[PDB]
Design a protein around this ligand. Structure first.
Ligand SMILES: CCCCCCCCCCCCCCCCCC(=O)OC[C@H](COP(=O)([O-])OCC(O)COP(=O)([O-])OC[C@@H](COC(=O)CCCCCCCCCCCCCCCCC)OC(=O)CCCCCCCCCCCCCCCCC)OC(=O)CCCCCCCCCCCCCCCCC
Ligand SMILES: CCCCCCCCCCCCCCCCCC(=O)OC[C@H](COP(=O)([O-])OCC(O)COP(=O)([O-])OC[C@@H](COC(=O)CCCCCCCCCCCCCCCCC)OC(=O)CCCCCCCCCCCCCCCCC)OC(=O)CCCCCCCCCCCCCCCCC
Ligand SMILES: CCCCCCCCCCCCCCCCC[C@@H](O)O[C@H](CO[C@H](O)CCCCCCCCCCCCCCC)COP(=O)(O)OCC[N+](C)(C)C
Ligand SMILES: CCCCCCCCCCCCCCCCC[C@@H](O)O[C@H](CO[C@H](O)CCCCCCCCCCCCCCC)COP(=O)(O)OCC[N+](C)(C)C
Ligand SMILES: CCCCCCCCCCCCCCCCC[C@@H](O)O[C@H](CO[C@H](O)CCCCCCCCCCCCCCC)COP(=O)(O)OCC[N+](C)(C)C
Ligand SMILES: CCCCCCCC/C=C\CCCCCCCC(=O)OC[C@H](COP(=O)(O)OCCN)OC(=O)CCCCCCC/C=C\CCCCCCCC
Ligand SMILES: Nc1ncnc2c1ncn2[C@@H]1O[C@H](COP(=O)(O)OP(=O)(O)O)[C@@H](O)[C@H]1O
Lengths: 42, 347, 56, 40, 107, 459, 320, 121, 98
């Protein structure tokens, strides 16, 4: 109809994407360190 | 009906299925099937008209008969071994009664006759639920006791289902009957691999459910239940017809589409067991399904049919309700062939 | 005019960038098939005084 | 000069209750547009 | 018969358009003269000038990776050796018989 | 091999983000550049192959087909520019998308180190062609044609798939290299006979074999010009490539199993050549001529000698170019007359002389005039067949005579005689059409200078 | 929060909004009668909302901008041609009748939506009911075929079986000769060509098929030309009578929720106006359909959804 | 290979602890890139169905689709790799513990094996 | 396996066959289902009491309860179908055809 960009929904969407990406990066780093520690690489 | 009542009934259907899939006692599995049957009827009869009432009555009769046969098999198996746990059947007569009951619940041939009838009687949303969610519980029970099934009987019913779906879909102008016969053929494809690999059964179920969800949501969006009604869709929303055509190509098993993944894998699995003739007949029979999918694709997007004058008014309006999961369903039912080895996730 | 034809002729650059990316990907995929480098019976060779790998 | 597109007589092939009409199924009538029948 | 003898409301089939009418020097590519001329120019430059000439020259001068000259030089030196040493040119056995262990029949 | 695949994929975003009046120019320029890039796969080895990775490899059988496939797309764009002028921008972009997708599938099909990957892409090519035929075809029969073109193919292709997976259960691999190095003789058994048939019939139906050739005149007559071009130039050669690849595991059973197919081909080439003599449709005539040439290619592959394979490669390339040119000439006539009947527009040499020269050159190269590569392939196959049996020379000579007859009949009917009086809409030929014909014909006469580039891996 | 099941679950019930004044009213009468003035007076006096009679471009007034669109893109019919050549070879008469019925259906859905959403009553001219009377006349004068009226009957059944009829039906009774006098005194050259037989058929099929049928499910107030001038007595008559015979007293919250989901979604309202039944007067060829649809899409604010059209002036597109 | 009853299997555990002994998929894994591409296609189709400018309608929505597809694809790839590692582990252990069923065949060269020759004529 | 169990199973088979003929009277279909559950109850009770499996003394009750609930639903459906035609004849449900 006649609507402005819903800044609430936009903020939630951007925040969800940023949180998911940050969580994925942290998970990958934890996985790499755990694999190296458990297999005696570094 | 009241939206709260509708939500409660849907959650009761889902809770019955979950009770079937989480329990280890035959009585609790029977109770889950009973709960699912009980809460399913008003959902089919949501849009009150004599057709829906007739469909609900046919569905109730078939499913109650199947439940009675299931309880009979449970009692015979208990008689020949004092066991209530879902594992082995312990009797040839109890296993045959059980396979018959689960085939009637699934709609496998020769117990397929109710599927087109009920699907034509009910609306598109009820048909979506009926053809997607109602297969999870009988197939889970079959996956649990697959090592007991006589492969001859299961393979006979699977081949019969594939043949019947292929031949019965060729004669249909109604879209809901086409969906019902497609469901019958896909059930046949699923149950032909249970004796060998239940992982392939689950993979086929997932792919079929994705394609069926996309197809039903496209049919609801362009609210057509007839071939000629679907022929008018291009003059309002051609992109919907294009997506429908690609989805029908996927449903026919044409590579490199997603629908090619199950059959391929199934064929592959069946060749590891020195089974050659049956997969060949299965593929040659699935050609019929592809043929009537192509007829629908011709009628929908590849050619432009005559329209009516009043359609111009429809050009001025947009859908009030939109489906959140339709794009994901389309992409998943069309473009996941490169991700095939992920089936080792034992989906 | 710069910053105007770019918005109009930007599409042309894509085919060449795809070619460069494909060349890089071909080299990258090549880098993982070096199990027999300088190990075949036919071309088993002694390294030069300032050579590390016989091919890349 | 113009690509062929289906006309009314072509589209009417797909308007029956079933494909491939026969003598036994000739009397069959397509279902109502809304899935509601007269109560008589 | 009150019917109009008309099956439906349809556009009449149009007559095909001539590109030479609104534009002599039309090159048959597009109805816009500038786009037409530049489409001609790019087709001719990238098809005849670049691919057809430079590609043909590139194929003509492709290095001898099929090893025809190498094969002829190897054969020349091999013939030179065998003629001088009295050897019977090419041999009938492709592999040395001493490194073949035949199965005894003893029948 | 990704240096060719990635630009072809980038052709799609470049097409869809192009201006409404810049799609043809950009597509043509970048397709020509991709052809130039692909031209550097002709540097082949006398050793094994160009094994780029675990997924893609190049061969001197693959490289000429790849170069032809890349070169065909710009010509198809030029040919399609005319009859799609009154079309919406979105649908023109969709047509170009279909063409690009078909090129991508063909390029990946021809490299495809795996037999299952080859099968998947070999069947993926079936979808864009079907859409092109059934969507942008003019007549009402296009739908029917599509149905034929589909089911025939699948009728042969589903058994192959079964056989394929079966082989991997016994051999353990479907990689061409391991398959070739670890090949073992195929016993003379019923199971092996049916495995042989499953392996062969999929490629046999696509050549097409004489018995199974009915889909081809339908599909070619019904398809638009670009569809006809790609069907005659590249899609028919998928069967030949597949047979040459797969016959390595079918020995020695090929000696016995080849007899029915050899007889079908040697008699059906005569049959289809004679059919061409009584044909009222240009496109149908060119389609039947294609059937005859592919019958000769089938004979070559079944004989399975070095000269047979060299001749088959040369003939496949030469026929692709020649048949594409012939379809383009017929389409230039059709876009003026709108009839597609040979007897209608007559005496066109008096009205369009340069196009008459193009017609003459195309007819001469279809006629296998030496030293064209058409005759190089023809002669190599004929010599191999003569060594196979000296009585084949009768059928080969009859085929040559009938081929000359219908080629010159098609030339004389359309170009010679008196012009039809009531046809007054015949305009001078456009620069686009003349350039299209030249870009078809100059590569053939250049290839006759370096024949070893198209003689395959047994050269 | 657009209306739906969630709003109904949380607080939204339409029975609390009804204050015995909703009472949807529909005024009728002949072609040239003072039904519009009487309807407007009723709407002003009762405090209800007036809906001017639906025309060729009624749907144009509720979509995009309210400005009407071109005739070839909206309706593809004209009343002036129907008056000039009622027996035209292109089937303008039945195309006009069907488009007008679809407009009536859209306007009735809009009125029902307004009443069920706000509780305020509405006043209408000719509704989906009594729209057939013109059709009947067109059949008896020979302007349309019997297949046309059969297709009209099918569409009318499958569409009008879904709505609640008006509480009050108001009819203005004016005889044919004085209507004709009004027509000549009007001055419209196309309006001049109406015969007396056409008006007589309209009135006869009007008070011989529409009055008894609404008498059994609605409350009808017949008025003459003289006694329709004074709206005070009409308002008094409307207020005095109480509706307890129709379907309205049997409605409740869940039936109202169903109807409110129905009256929204104008696409689902108009679903059966384009049923695949091929009458030459209304079926349109594939080529013309494609051309006209492409022309409609190229309209300024019609390529995308209402809020996503840059040329009209919609901003912030990339964040919506 | 039915591993449903494999001993020491926690019932509803998506990724067991021992799966942490395996190298995680790289963030630039081609399969992760394909999952992101699938999310992008879903965003484009979402824009197209709702009649919005397909390429540039909602950037937040397309970003969310891509991100969610990448997230689920990463975890799915981990589970896939773990299951294949279990299959190989079990197969090698079974071959080790059953030496009589997988014998060491004698090494024979082609110079001492007689293969039938079939001339092509 | 005694003769009593076979007699009960044959009663179950007869009830199922009766449900399968469909002469008329969907009412009779519901009767056949109820006879089937009666035979099920009897035979399960006999098996459970014979083996002294104390806890499964629950399940006949349970079975009974659930079956009767089903019957109620079925009866309701019957009424509505009859409410359309005035009779419960099986052959009246011929509107939907395969
Ligand atoms: C092999 C794998 C590799 C390739 C992958 C291929 C798949 C990828 C994409 C998958 C799907 C996603 C997109 C589909 C959404 C559809 C949207 C659409 O309609 O298009 C309009 C839209 C523009 O038009 P618009 O003004 O916005 O609105 C017009 C309306 O949308 C509607 O317009 P309209 O109403 O005016 O016209 C109506 C039209 C509209 O109907 C359609 O447009 C059809 C849409 C396609 C169906 C999608 C199905 C789902 C996926 C199937 C994939 C199949 C592949 C398998 C092989 C089988 C081949 C079929 O329908 C018809 O005309 C009916 C007749 C059609 C003939 C029969 C139908 C055949 C369709 C088959 C198409 C298959 C390929 C599609 C490619 C994408 C096309 C946009 O097109 C686009 O711009 C989208 C294209 C993608 C944008 C790319 C942006 C990236 C560029 C910059 C980055 C550079 C990259 C590299 C980075 C580094 C560089 C430095
Ligand atoms: C013989 C040596 C000649 C050397 C000189 C260099 C010639 C270069 C030609 C390159 C290929 C031609 C390009 C095709 C398009 C035609 C050009 C055009 O548009 O014409 C407009 C142009 C302007 O005239 P216009 O008045 O404005 O146009 C009016 C109409 O067009 C009406 O025009 P029109 O009435 O004047 O007729 C057009 C003309 C042109 O149309 C054609 O038909 C030309 C194409 C004929 C070949 C047919 C296919 C058969 C396959 C043979 C493959 C040979 C290619 C070799 C390598 C080529 C390298 C790219 O047609 C003919 O005159 C009939 C000629 C029949 C030739 C049959 C003999 C074939 C075997 C000959 C031996 C070749 C190998 C020898 C090996 C042993 C000794 C070393 O006219 C010309 O330039 C005529 C072209 C010259 C005639 C070609 C005949 C000999 C050339 C054979 C190929 C190269 C031989 C290399 C060996 C050198 C030692
Ligand atoms: C068809 C395309 C894919 C669609 C799938 C739906 C996508 C959305 C699902 C979102 C994530 C769901 C995962 C649930 C979180 C934890 C699940 C965990 O607790 O359960 C595990 C189970 O994990 C799941 O089974 C794996 C789900 C992964 C499904 C994807 C594979 C599809 C095949 C590849 C096609 C490409 C699709 C990729 C794009 C989506 C353990 O199950 P277990 O109690 O031990 O055994 C019971 C099942 N048995 C009997 C079959 C063995
Ligand atoms: C109008 C009349 C003409 C006017 C002009 C008069 C002059 C005419 C003279 C030209 C024709 C006469 C023939 C004379 C031939 C001379 C050139 C020839 O000798 O070169 C050939 C070379 O030609 C090329 O090999 C063949 C052309 C390449 C073909 C590629 C096609 C272009 C790509 C476009 C895509 C097409 C797709 C086709 C699918 C495969 C053979 O060379 P070669 O003896 O070996 O060794 C070269 C030198 N070395 C020793 C250093 C290596
Ligand atoms: C239709 C358009 C073209 C389609 C493609 C046509 C090409 C397919 C033709 C198939 C090739 C031949 C099939 C089998 C060839 C083997 C030779 C055998 O048939 O002949 C004799 C076999 O004798 C008899 O022929 C037995 C078979 C008789 C039954 C076959 C039906 C005959 C006509 C049917 C033709 C229909 C073909 C199409 C079916 C849809 C040999 O005697 P014998 O030494 O004992 O057998 C040696 C082989 N062994 C060792 C494996 C046992
Ligand atoms: C449909 C049923 C087809 C019946 C054919 C049976 C062939 C068969 O079973 O052979 C299997 C054989 C190996 O034998 P085993 O059973 O594994 O063991 C034998 C030694 N103990 O495996 C295979 O080769 C499978 C290959 C597929 C079989 C072919 C099926 C179709 C017929 C052959 C293709 C020819 C028709 C093509 C149609 C062309 C139309 C354009
Ligand atoms: N269903 C219909 N069919 C044909 N014409 C109609 C229809 N409805 C309204 N009209 C035309 O609309 C015009 C205005 O309607 P009318 O009530 O007669 O005038 P007024 O606006 O003064 O009340 C009239 O010429 C009438 O014929």
């Amino acid at each position: 109809p006649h609507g402005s960009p819903d800044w609430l929904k936009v903020g939630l969407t951007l925040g969800t994407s940023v949180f998911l990406w940050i969580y994925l990066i942290k998970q990958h780093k934890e996985d790499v360190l755990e694999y190296k520690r458990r297999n005696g690489l570094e | 009906m009241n939206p709260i009542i509708y939500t409660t009934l849907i959650m009761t259907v889902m809770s019955g299925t979950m009770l079937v899939m989480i329990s280890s006692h035959w009585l609790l599995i029977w109770i889950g099937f009973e709960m699912n049957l009980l809460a399913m009827i008003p959902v089919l009869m949501k849009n009150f008209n004599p057709r829906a009432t007739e469909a609900a009555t046919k569905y109730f009769l078939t499913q109650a008969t199947a439940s009675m046969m299931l309880m009979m098999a449970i009692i015979i198996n208990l008689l020949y071994s004092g066991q209530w746990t879902i594992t082995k059947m312990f009797n040839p007569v109890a296993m045959t009664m059980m396979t018959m009951a689960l085939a009637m619940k699934l709609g496998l041939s020769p117990f397929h006759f109710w599927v087109p009838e009920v699907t034509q009687g009910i609306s598109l949303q009820a048909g979506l639920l009926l053809l997607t969610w109602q297969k999870l519980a009988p197939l889970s029970v079959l996956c649990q006791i697959s090592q007991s099934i006589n492969p001859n009987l299961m393979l006979t019913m699977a081949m019969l289902s594939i043949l019947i779906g292929g031949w019965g879909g060729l004669n249909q102008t109604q879209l809901r009957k086409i969906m019902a016969y497609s469901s019958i053929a896909h059930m046949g494809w699923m149950t032909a691999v249970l004796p060998y690999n239940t992982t392939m059964t689950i993979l086929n179920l997932l792919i079929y459910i994705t394609m069926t969800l996309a197809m039903f949501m496209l049919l609801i969006h362009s609210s057509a239940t007839t071939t000629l009604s679907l022929s008018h869709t291009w003059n309002k929303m051609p992109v919907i017809t294009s997506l429908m055509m690609v989805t029908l190509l996927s449903m026919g098993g044409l590579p490199p589409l997603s629908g090619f993944m199950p059959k391929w894998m199934i064929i592959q699995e069946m060749t590891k067991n020195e089974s050659i003739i049956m997969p060949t007949l299965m593929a040659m029979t699935a050609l019929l399904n592809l043929y009537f999918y192509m007829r629908l694709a011709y009628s929908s997007s590849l050619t432009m049919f005559p329209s009516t004058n009043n359609m111009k008014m429809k050009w001025q309006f947009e859908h009030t309700k939109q489906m959140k999961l339709l794009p994901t369903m389309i992409v998943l039912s069309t473009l996941v062939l490169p991700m095939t080895p992920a089936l080792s996730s034992l989906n | 005019n710069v910053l105007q034809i770019v918005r109009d002729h930007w599409v042309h650059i894509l085919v060449p960038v795809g070619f460069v990316f494909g060349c890089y990907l071909d080299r990258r995929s090549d880098e993982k098939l070096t199990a027999f480098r300088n190990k075949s019976l036919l071309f088993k060779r002694e390294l030069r005084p300032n050579e590390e790998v016989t091919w890349k | 000069a113009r690509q062929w597109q289906p006309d009314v007589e072509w589209a009417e092939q797909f308007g029956g209750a079933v494909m491939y009409p026969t003598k036994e199924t000739a009397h069959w009538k397509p279902p109502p547009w809304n899935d509601v029948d007269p109560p008589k | 018969p009150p019917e109009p003898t008309i099956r439906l409301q349809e556009d009449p089939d149009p007559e095909d358009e001539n590109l030479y009418e609104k534009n002599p020097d039309s090159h048959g590519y597009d109805k816009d003269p500038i786009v037409d001329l530049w489409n001609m120019r790019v087709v001719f430059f990238f098809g005849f000038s670049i691919v057809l000439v430079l590609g043909s020259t590139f194929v003509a001068y492709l290095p001898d990776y099929r090893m025809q000259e190498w094969a002829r030089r190897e054969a020349e030196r091999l013939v030179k050796y065998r003629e001088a040493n009295g050897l019977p040119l090419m041999e009938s056995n492709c592999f040395d018989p001493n490194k073949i262990q035949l199965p005894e029949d003893e029948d | 091999m990704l240096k060719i695949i990635i630009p072809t994929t980038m052709l799609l975003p470049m097409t869809w983000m192009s201006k409404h009046n810049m799609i043809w120019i950009n597509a043509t320029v970048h397709s020509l550049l991709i052809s130039l890039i692909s031209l550097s796969l002709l540097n082949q080895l006398g050793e094994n192959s160009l094994n780029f990775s675990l997924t893609f490899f190049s061969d001197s059988l693959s490289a000429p087909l790849l170069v032809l496939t890349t070169w065909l797309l710009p010509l198809m764009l030029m040919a399609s520019q005319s009859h799609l002028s009154k079309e919406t921008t979105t649908r023109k972009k969709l047509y170009i998308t279909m063409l690009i997708l078909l090129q991508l599938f063909l390029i990946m099909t021809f490299t495809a180190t795996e037999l299952i990957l080859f099968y998947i892409l070999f069947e993926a090519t079936l979808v864009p062609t079907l859409i092109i035929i059934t969507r942008w075809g003019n007549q009402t029969e296009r739908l029917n044609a599509g149905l034929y073109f589909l089911f025939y193919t699948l009728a042969g292709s589903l058994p192959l798939l079964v056989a394929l997976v079966y082989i991997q259960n016994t051999t353990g691999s479907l990689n061409f290299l391991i398959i070739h190095y670890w090949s073992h003789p195929l016993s003379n058994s019923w199971s092996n006979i049916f495995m042989w048939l499953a392996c062969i019939m999929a490629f046999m139906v696509k050549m097409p074999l004489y018995g199974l050739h009915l889909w081809l005149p339908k599909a070619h007559v019904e398809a638009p010009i670009a569809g006809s071009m790609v069907l005659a130039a590249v899609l028919l050669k998928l069967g030949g490539y597949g047979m040459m690849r797969i016959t390595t595991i079918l020995n020695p059973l090929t000696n016995y199993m080849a007899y029915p197919f050899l007889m079908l081909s040697m008699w059906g080439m005569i049959m289809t050549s004679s059919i061409c003599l009584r044909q009222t449709d240009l496109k149908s005539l060119i389609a039947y001529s294609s059937v005859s040439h592919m019958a000769l290619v089938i004979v070559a592959i079944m004989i399975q000698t070095p000269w047979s394979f060299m001749g088959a490669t040369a003939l496949m390339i030469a026929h692709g170019l020649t048949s594409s040119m012939l379809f383009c000439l017929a389409n230039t006539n059709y876009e003026r007359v709108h009839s597609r009947t040979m007897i209608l527009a007559r005496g066109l040499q008096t009205l369009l002389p340069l196009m008459a020269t193009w017609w003459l050159v195309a007819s001469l190269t279809n006629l296998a005039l030496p030293p064209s590569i058409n005759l190089i392939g023809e002669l190599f196959i004929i010599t191999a067949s003569f060594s196979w049996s000296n009585i084949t020379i009768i059928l080969m000579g009859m085929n040559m005579m009938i081929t000359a007859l219908y080629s010159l009949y098609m030339l004389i009917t359309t170009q010679r005689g008196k012009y039809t009086h009531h046809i007054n809409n015949i305009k001078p030929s456009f620069t686009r059409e003349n350039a299209l014909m030249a870009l078809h014909i100059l590569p053939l006469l250049l290839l006759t200078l370096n024949p070893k580039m198209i003689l395959g891996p047994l050269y | 929060l657009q209306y739906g099941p969630l709003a109904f679950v949380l607080g939204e019930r339409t029975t609390r909004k009804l204050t015995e004044t909703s009472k949807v009213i529909t005024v009728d009468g002949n072609i040239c009668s003072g039904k519009g003035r009487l309807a407007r007076e009723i709407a002003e006096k009762l405090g209800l909302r007036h809906f001017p009679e639906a025309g060729i471009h009624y749907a144009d007034s509720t979509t995009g901008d309210g400005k009407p669109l071109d005739v070839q893109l909206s309706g593809n019919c004209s009343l002036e041609k129907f008056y000039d050549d009622p027996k035209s070879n292109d089937g303008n008469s039945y195309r006009l009748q069907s488009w007008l019925y679809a407009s009536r259906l859209l306007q009735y859905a809009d009125a029902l939506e307004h009443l069920l959403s706000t509780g305020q009553g509405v006043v209408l001219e000719r509704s989906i009911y009594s729209d057939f009377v013109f059709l009947e006349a067109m059949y008896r004068q020979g302007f349309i075929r019997k297949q046309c009226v059969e297709h009209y009957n099918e569409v009318k059944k499958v569409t009008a079986c879904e709505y609640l009829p008006p509480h009050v039906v108001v009819y203005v009774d004016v005889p044919v000769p004085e209507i004709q006098s009004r027509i000549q005194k009007k001055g419209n050259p196309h309006e001049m060509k109406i015969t007396a037989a056409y008006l007589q058929d309209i009135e006869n099929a009007y008070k011989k098929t529409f009055l008894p049928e609404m008498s059994e499910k609605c409350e009808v107030l017949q008025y003459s030309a003289r006694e329709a001038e004074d709206a005070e007595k009409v308002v008094e008559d409307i207020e005095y009578l109480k509706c307890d015979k129709g379907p309205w007293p049997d409605q409740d919250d869940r039936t109202f929720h169903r109807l409110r989901m129905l009256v929204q979604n104008k696409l689902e309202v108009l679903n059966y106006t384009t049923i695949p039944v091929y009458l030459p007067e209304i079926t349109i060829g594939a080529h013309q359909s494609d051309r006209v649809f492409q022309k409609f899409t190229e309209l300024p604010g019609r390529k995308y959804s209402p809020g996503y059209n840059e040329d009209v002036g919609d901003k912030w597109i990339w964040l919506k | 290979t039915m591993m449903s009853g494999r001993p020491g299997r926690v019932p509803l555990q998506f990724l067991p602890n021992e799966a942490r002994s395996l190298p995680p998929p790289k963030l630039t894994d081609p399969r992760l890139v394909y999952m992101g591409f699938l999310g992008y296609c879903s965003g484009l189709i979402d824009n197209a169905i709702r009649r919005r400018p397909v390429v540039s309608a909602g950037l937040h929505r397309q970003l969310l689709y891509v991100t969610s597809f990448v997230f689920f694809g990463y975890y799915l790839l981990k589970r896939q790799d773990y299951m294949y590692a279990l299959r190989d582990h079990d197969m090698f252990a079974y071959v080790k513990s059953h030496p009589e069923d997988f014998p060491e065949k004698d090494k024979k060269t082609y110079g001492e094996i007689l293969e039938e020759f079939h001339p092509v004529r | 396996m005694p003769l009593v169990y076979m007699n009960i199973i044959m009663a179950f088979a007869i009830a199922l066959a009766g449900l399968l003929m469909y002469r008329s009277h969907l009412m009779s279909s519901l009767l056949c289902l109820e006879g089937m559950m009666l035979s099920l109850f009897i035979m399960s009770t006999l098996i459970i009491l014979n083996t002294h499996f104390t806890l499964a003394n629950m399940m006949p009750i349970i079975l009974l309860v659930f079956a009767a609930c089903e019957a109620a639903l079925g009866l309701s459906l019957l009424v509505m179908v009859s409410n359309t035609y005035g009779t419960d004849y099986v052959q009246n449900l011929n509107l939907l055809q395969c």
